[PDB]
Amino acid sequence: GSIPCLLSPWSEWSDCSVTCGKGMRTRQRMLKSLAELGDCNEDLEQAEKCMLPECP
């Protein structure tokens, strides 16, 4: 079974980069390819859009 590179699942997203108004969030993971399957150009970090409500 020629599967893609052994990578851990994406962990839960942390709090957003802003408290109110326009903003974004980010999350990361790590490789778990102990069997040295190779080395892939696959992603370990990802970003997402997340605007918070008006500033309190």
Curated annotation (Swiss-Prot):
Which residues does the UniProt record annotate as the domain TSP type-1? 4-56
Organism taxonomic ancestry: Eukaryota, Metazoa, Chordata, Craniata, Vertebrata
Compartmental location: Secreted, Extracellular space, Extracellular matrix
Q: How does it assemble?
A: Binds to the central extracellular domain of APP and inhibits beta-secretase cleavage of APP.
Q: What is this protein called?
A: Spondin-1
- List the cysteine pairs that form cystine: C5-C40, C16-C20, C50-C55
The source's superkingdom equals: Eukaryota
Q: Where are the transmembrane segments?
A: none
Q: Which residues of the full protein are shown?
A: 613 to 666 of 807
Tissues expressing this chain:
Expressed at high levels in the floor plate.
Per the UniProt entry, what species is this protein from, by scientific name? Rattus norvegicus
Give the function comment from the record: Cell adhesion protein that promotes the attachment of spinal cord and sensory neuron cells and the outgrowth of neurites in vitro. May contribute to the growth and guidance of axons in both the spinal cord and the PNS.
